[PDB]
């Protein structure tokens, strides 16, 4: 992979999981 | 090259180089005894004079500020000393 798009994928994963954190509270 | 005498550079070579790089750090400047076209008095001036040197006798500014030596006033006479 281009490291750029792997970083983007992990970044979006982080955003989704932190929205999960926010919705859980 | 590869063999010199740094004690005894050629005087032409010595002045050829830059100051602060010679054997002894000597100044390039000098002092000129300048006389105004009006008054016969003698006024000493540093060659690279910074301020507008004025003869105390009369308001006859002799040398004007410049990057290098001050420019004389077209009528004075200078003596090297």
């Amino acid at each position: 992979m281009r490291a750029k798009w792997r970083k983007k994928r992990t970044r979006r994963l982080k955003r989704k999981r932190r929205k999960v954190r926010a919705r859980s509270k | 090259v590869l063999v010199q005498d740094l004690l005894h550079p050629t005087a032409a070579s010595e002045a050829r180089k830059h100051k602060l790089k010679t054997l002894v750090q000597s100044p390039r400047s000098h002092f000129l005894d300048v006389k105004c076209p009006g008054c016969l008095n003698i006024t000493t001036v540093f060659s690279h004079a910074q301020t507008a040197v004025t003869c105390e006798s009369c308001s006859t500014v002799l040398c004007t500020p410049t990057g290098g030596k001050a420019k004389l006033s077209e009528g004075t006479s200078f003596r090297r000393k």
């Binding site: - | 002092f31 006024t43 000493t44 910074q50």
Partner: protein, 151 residues
């Protein structure tokens, strides 16, 4: 070539001559030198101005060469030394000028950067002078006593 705050490496300076004693052709008296030094000081010119004027107008090469002592020391012995050394005072003057410019027009950021550089230099020099104890150990330079010392 140091130039703390700019990578400039110049060496613009002066190479004073090797002869410690006076030039052989000088006709002025060392004492008369001293009285003209003190009177120009009474006029208020700083010792740098004093030196440049005595070099331009008269055969005064270095007052240390002629009188055997240096201009600031002549002033101190004669009791005309300023409370703040001249270089420092010029630093305060420049710093306050930059401060006035900056407060006048906000968005200039390189002005702020140069102000930080000038404050660094002035703190440094003040530290030195306090170590040599020319300044009082409580002498401090921030903004307002700065403006008072500008006066």
């Amino acid at each position: 070539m140091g130039r703390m705050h700019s990578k400039g490496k110049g060496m613009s300076s002066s190479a004073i001559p090797y002869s410690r004693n006076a030039p052989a052709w000088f006709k002025g008296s060392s004492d008369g030198v001293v009285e003209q030094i003190i009177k120009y000081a009474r006029k208020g010119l700083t010792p740098s101005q004093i030196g440049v004027l005595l070099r331009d107008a008269h055969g005064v090469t270095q007052a240390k060469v002629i009188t055997g002592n240096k201009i600031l020391r002549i002033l101190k012995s004669n009791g005309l030394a300023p409370e703040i050394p001249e270089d420092l005072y010029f630093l305060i003057k420049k710093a306050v000028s930059v401060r006035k410019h900056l407060e006048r027009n906000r968005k200039d950021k390189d002005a702020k950067f140069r102000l930080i550089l000038i404050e660094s230099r002035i703190h440094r020099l003040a530290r030195y002078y306090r170590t040599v104890s020319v300044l009082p150990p409580n002498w401090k330079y921030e903004s307002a006593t700065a403006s008072a010392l500008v006066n």
